[PDB]
Design a protein around this motif. Sequence first.
Motif, PDB file in Angstrom:
ATOM      1  N   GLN A  15      29.486   9.937 -34.067  1.00  0.00           N
ATOM      2  CA  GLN A  15      30.325   9.756 -32.671  1.00  0.00           C
ATOM      3  C   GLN A  15      30.779  11.195 -32.272  1.00  0.00           C
ATOM      4  O   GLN A  15      30.497  11.270 -31.085  1.00  0.00           O
ATOM      5  CB  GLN A  15      31.729   9.121 -33.221  1.00  0.00           C
ATOM      6  N   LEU A  16      31.151  12.001 -33.184  1.00  0.00           N
ATOM      7  CA  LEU A  16      31.667  13.250 -32.574  1.00  0.00           C
ATOM      8  C   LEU A  16      30.435  14.336 -32.379  1.00  0.00           C
ATOM      9  O   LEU A  16      30.380  14.695 -31.034  1.00  0.00           O
ATOM     10  CB  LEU A  16      32.582  13.989 -33.423  1.00  0.00           C
ATOM     11  N   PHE A  21      28.602  18.599 -30.849  1.00  0.00           N
ATOM     12  CA  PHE A  21      29.187  19.479 -31.887  1.00  0.00           C
ATOM     13  C   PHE A  21      28.182  19.852 -32.831  1.00  0.00           C
ATOM     14  O   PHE A  21      27.210  19.443 -32.911  1.00  0.00           O
ATOM     15  CB  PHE A  21      30.347  18.659 -32.479  1.00  0.00           C
ATOM     16  N   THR A  22      28.524  20.451 -33.800  1.00  0.00           N
ATOM     17  CA  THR A  22      27.798  20.821 -35.095  1.00  0.00           C
ATOM     18  C   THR A  22      28.165  19.934 -36.285  1.00  0.00           C
ATOM     19  O   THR A  22      29.382  19.921 -36.908  1.00  0.00           O
ATOM     20  CB  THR A  22      27.950  22.386 -35.377  1.00  0.00           C
ATOM     21  N   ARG A  23      27.001  19.505 -36.981  1.00  0.00           N
ATOM     22  CA  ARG A  23      27.362  19.010 -38.207  1.00  0.00           C
ATOM     23  C   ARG A  23      28.357  19.396 -39.203  1.00  0.00           C
ATOM     24  O   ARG A  23      29.185  18.807 -39.985  1.00  0.00           O
ATOM     25  CB  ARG A  23      25.952  18.437 -38.688  1.00  0.00           C
ATOM     26  N   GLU A  24      28.028  20.669 -39.138  1.00  0.00           N
ATOM     27  CA  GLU A  24      28.692  21.646 -40.120  1.00  0.00           C
ATOM     28  C   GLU A  24      30.253  21.357 -39.880  1.00  0.00           C
ATOM     29  O   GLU A  24      30.970  20.997 -41.016  1.00  0.00           O
ATOM     30  CB  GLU A  24      28.400  22.898 -39.900  1.00  0.00           C
ATOM     31  N   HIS A  25      30.605  21.633 -38.942  1.00  0.00           N
ATOM     32  CA  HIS A  25      32.169  21.490 -38.380  1.00  0.00           C
ATOM     33  C   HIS A  25      32.535  20.317 -38.579  1.00  0.00           C
ATOM     34  O   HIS A  25      33.525  19.538 -39.077  1.00  0.00           O
ATOM     35  CB  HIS A  25      32.518  22.202 -37.120  1.00  0.00           C
ATOM     36  N   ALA A  26      31.614  19.126 -37.606  1.00  0.00           N
ATOM     37  CA  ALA A  26      31.994  17.706 -37.742  1.00  0.00           C
ATOM     38  C   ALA A  26      32.175  17.341 -39.183  1.00  0.00           C
ATOM     39  O   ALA A  26      33.211  16.599 -39.304  1.00  0.00           O
ATOM     40  CB  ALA A  26      30.530  17.058 -37.267  1.00  0.00           C
ATOM     41  N   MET A  27      31.238  17.729 -40.051  1.00  0.00           N
ATOM     42  CA  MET A  27      31.444  17.144 -41.439  1.00  0.00           C
ATOM     43  C   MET A  27      32.905  17.586 -41.872  1.00  0.00           C
ATOM     44  O   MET A  27      33.731  16.849 -42.365  1.00  0.00           O
ATOM     45  CB  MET A  27      30.380  17.739 -42.401  1.00  0.00           C
ATOM     46  N   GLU A  28      33.051  18.834 -42.146  1.00  0.00           N
ATOM     47  CA  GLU A  28      34.003  19.445 -42.647  1.00  0.00           C
ATOM     48  C   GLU A  28      35.626  18.835 -41.832  1.00  0.00           C
ATOM     49  O   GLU A  28      36.465  18.647 -42.381  1.00  0.00           O
ATOM     50  CB  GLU A  28      34.271  21.089 -42.195  1.00  0.00           C
ATOM     51  N   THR A  40      38.481  14.680 -33.810  1.00  0.00           N
ATOM     52  CA  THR A  40      38.133  15.003 -32.496  1.00  0.00           C
ATOM     53  C   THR A  40      38.796  16.469 -32.291  1.00  0.00           C
ATOM     54  O   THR A  40      38.179  17.329 -31.984  1.00  0.00           O
ATOM     55  CB  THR A  40      38.736  13.992 -31.334  1.00  0.00           C
ATOM     56  N   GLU A  41      40.206  16.366 -32.692  1.00  0.00           N
ATOM     57  CA  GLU A  41      40.999  17.682 -32.494  1.00  0.00           C
ATOM     58  C   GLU A  41      40.147  18.670 -33.270  1.00  0.00           C
ATOM     59  O   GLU A  41      39.975  19.693 -32.532  1.00  0.00           O
ATOM     60  CB  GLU A  41      42.296  17.467 -33.164  1.00  0.00           C
ATOM     61  N   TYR A  42      39.990  18.438 -34.605  1.00  0.00           N
ATOM     62  CA  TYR A  42      39.387  19.718 -35.277  1.00  0.00           C
ATOM     63  C   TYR A  42      38.281  20.267 -34.641  1.00  0.00           C
ATOM     64  O   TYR A  42      38.056  21.393 -34.662  1.00  0.00           O
ATOM     65  CB  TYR A  42      38.726  18.941 -36.723  1.00  0.00           C
ATOM     66  N   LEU A  43      37.319  19.272 -34.098  1.00  0.00           N
ATOM     67  CA  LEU A  43      36.478  19.727 -33.142  1.00  0.00           C
ATOM     68  C   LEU A  43      36.552  20.377 -31.848  1.00  0.00           C
ATOM     69  O   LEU A  43      36.212  21.490 -31.604  1.00  0.00           O
ATOM     70  CB  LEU A  43      35.361  18.663 -33.203  1.00  0.00           C
TER      71      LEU A  43
END
Length: 47
Positions: A15-16, A21-28, A40-43
């Motif tokens: 979704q994100l 975005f990047t799977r890296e951040h997405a995942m984390e 969402t926010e995190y991203l």
Amino acid sequence: GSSGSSGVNQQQLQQLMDMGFTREHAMEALLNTSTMEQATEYLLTHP
């Protein structure tokens, strides 16, 4: 049979990740967060 949720969730991830975005951040993000919104926010906080 047995079924449920294990670890993060592709839904939110993808979704994100879709938003651009990047799977890296997405995942984390998810991992760190708990709900979708939070993710969402995190991203949003890490473009």
